[PDB]
Design an enzyme around this catalytic site. Sequence first.
Site, PDB file in Angstrom:
ATOM      1  N   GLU A  11       0.788  -0.928   0.583  1.00 29.48           N
ATOM      2  CA  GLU A  11       0.351  -0.187  -0.302  1.00 29.48           C
ATOM      3  C   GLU A  11       1.168   1.056  -0.087  1.00 29.48           C
ATOM      4  OE1 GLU A  11      -3.844  -1.686  -0.331  1.00 29.48           O
ATOM      5  OE2 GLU A  11      -3.127  -0.054  -0.664  1.00 29.48           O
ATOM      6  N   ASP A  20      -6.254   6.405  -5.685  1.00 29.06           N
ATOM      7  CA  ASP A  20      -5.835   5.087  -5.642  1.00 29.06           C
ATOM      8  C   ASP A  20      -5.505   4.576  -7.262  1.00 29.06           C
ATOM      9  OD1 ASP A  20      -8.763   2.469  -4.526  1.00 29.06           O
ATOM     10  OD2 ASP A  20      -8.145   4.598  -3.917  1.00 29.06           O
ATOM     11  N   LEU A  32      -8.998   4.146   1.604  1.00 33.01           N
ATOM     12  CA  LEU A  32     -10.111   4.621   1.486  1.00 33.01           C
ATOM     13  C   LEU A  32     -10.869   5.608   1.907  1.00 33.01           C
ATOM     14  CD1 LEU A  32     -11.242   4.293  -1.589  1.00 33.01           C
ATOM     15  CD2 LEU A  32     -12.925   2.998  -0.459  1.00 33.01           C
ATOM     16  N   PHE A 104      -8.458  -6.620   2.719  1.00 35.16           N
ATOM     17  CA  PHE A 104      -8.505  -5.238   3.089  1.00 35.16           C
ATOM     18  C   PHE A 104      -8.221  -4.217   1.649  1.00 35.16           C
ATOM     19  CE2 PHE A 104      -5.585  -2.441   5.433  1.00 35.16           C
ATOM     20  CZ  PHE A 104      -5.128  -1.455   4.754  1.00 35.16           C
ATOM     21  N   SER A 117     -11.755 -20.315  -6.181  1.00 36.70           N
ATOM     22  CA  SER A 117     -10.506 -19.849  -5.453  1.00 36.70           C
ATOM     23  C   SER A 117     -10.484 -20.555  -4.494  1.00 36.70           C
ATOM     24  CB  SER A 117      -9.623 -18.608  -5.396  1.00 36.70           C
ATOM     25  OG  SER A 117      -9.517 -18.471  -7.141  1.00 36.70           O
ATOM     26  N   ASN A 132      -5.752 -19.915 -11.136  1.00 43.99           N
ATOM     27  CA  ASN A 132      -7.851 -19.484 -11.293  1.00 43.99           C
ATOM     28  C   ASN A 132      -7.875 -18.458 -10.521  1.00 43.99           C
ATOM     29  OD1 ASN A 132     -10.429 -19.693  -9.298  1.00 43.99           O
ATOM     30  ND2 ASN A 132     -10.379 -20.551 -11.436  1.00 43.99           N
TER      31      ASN A 132
END
Length: 164
Positions: A11, A20, A32, A104, A117, A132
């Site tokens: 991040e 973003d 966010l 997250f 998955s 996948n």
Amino acid sequence: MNIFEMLRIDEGLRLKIYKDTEGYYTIGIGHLLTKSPSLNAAKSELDKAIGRNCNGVITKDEAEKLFNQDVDAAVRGILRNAKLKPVYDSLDAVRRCALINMVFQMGETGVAGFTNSLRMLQQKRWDEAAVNLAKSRWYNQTPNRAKRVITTFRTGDWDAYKNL
């Protein structure tokens, strides 16, 4: 390595309101603020989140506090989710970290949708699940990060983050 160090590699840290990969207003360690296009809406959410008049700017201290809240909420969200909980419980400590990072980044909602998955991870078919997971918008849009997470689920160790 731990979840906070992993996510902080993924991040970064920005002490000023930023956009973003998606164009959304964010601050700190991937917090966010709004999906709304007004910087003003973003600034308002910011001061609401911090409890002060920030004028679009925060301290390191404030960034880490939001990061503490965010990590705790991801974990607790996983735990409350009927789709997520069972996979999380089946996983080892490292792989649990890889699930927490997806949550997250994308939300509970977004991850609970990777039905096939999730099933493969529960079954411990690491290579199939890695294949996948790569077939997603997620991987196409943020391939370097997606590949780091995916390697973590395939291997069960932190090598993808050693480099970094």
